[PDB]
UniProtKB/Swiss-Prot annotation:
In the egg white and polymorphonuclear leukocytes. Lysozymes have primarily a bacteriolytic function; those in tissues and body fluids are associated with the monocyte-macrophage system and enhance the activity of immunoagents. Has bacteriolytic activity against M.luteus. Belongs to the glycosyl hydrolase 22 family. The active site is at 35, 52. Its EC number is 3.2.1.17. Monomer. Disulfide bonds join 6-127, 30-115, 64-80, 76-94. It holds the Pfam family Lys. This is Lysozyme C. Lysozyme C is capable of both hydrolysis and transglycosylation; it also shows a slight esterase activity. It acts rapidly on both peptide-substituted and unsubstituted peptidoglycan, and slowly on chitin oligosaccharides. It comes from Gallus gallus. One of its GO terms (cellular component) is endoplasmic reticulum. One of its GO terms (molecular function) is beta-N-acetylglucosaminidase activity.
Length: 129
């Protein structure tokens, strides 16, 4: 699934991400854009052999199990493939845990480099929310 911008904002809002740990909805939409281009099937390989999965590019190094990242964790207790579903419930539920893990949204490398300190409310411009 490739989500639309407001489509994803609405899904993220329904699922409770708006102001979750003080991160307004625009932060989440900005992160998803630069990490996956809003594509639930997105995957990427890290230098260490881990793989990032889904709309929020959740790293198998820490958060999900793919059977091929020796030494890794599965802190969201899900198969990484579940993070590729058209239903974002798994990804959002897992994201809530990631953002609460100490570094806030700095966990998303694209958020820190491209979203942090910028006018993120612009990512939900026009949405019926
Ligand atoms: C090629 C490429 O660029 N790929 C990227 C990919 O890297 C991106 O995925 C992200 O990867 C990074 C690096 O692997 C992940 O960042 C990890 O995440 C760890 C888990 O949250 C994090 O560990 C946590 O660190 C906290 C802060 O230090 C710990 O809490 C603190 O512990 C202190 C001392 O130990 C203690 O004194 C404090 O009380 C406490 N501080 C606070 C504020 O609470 C916490 O314990 C620890 N958690 C665990 C479970 O061990 C690492 O710090 C962090 N590494 C970094 C920043 O280098 C990140 O999670 C991945 N993101 C996602 C969404 O999966 C990917 C997505 O951005 O993009 C690809 O393109």
């Amino acid at each position: 699934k490739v989500f639309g911008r407001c489509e994803l904002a609405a899904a993220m809002k329904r699922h409770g991400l708006d102001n979750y740990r003080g991160y307004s909805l625009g932060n989440w939409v900005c992160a998803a854009k630069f990490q996956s281009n809003f594509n639930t099937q997105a995957t990427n390989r890290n230098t260490d052999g881990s793989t990032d999965y889904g709309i929020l590019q959740i790293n198998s190094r820490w958060w999900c199990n793919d059977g091929r990242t020796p030494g890794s964790r599965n802190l969201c207790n899900i198969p990484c493939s579940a993070l590729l579903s058209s239903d974002i419930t798994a990804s959002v539920n897992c994201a809530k845990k990631i953002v609460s893990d100490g570094n806030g949204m700095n966990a998303w490398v694209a958020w820190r480099n491209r979203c942090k300190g910028t006018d993120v409310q612009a990512w939900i411009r026009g949405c019926r929310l």
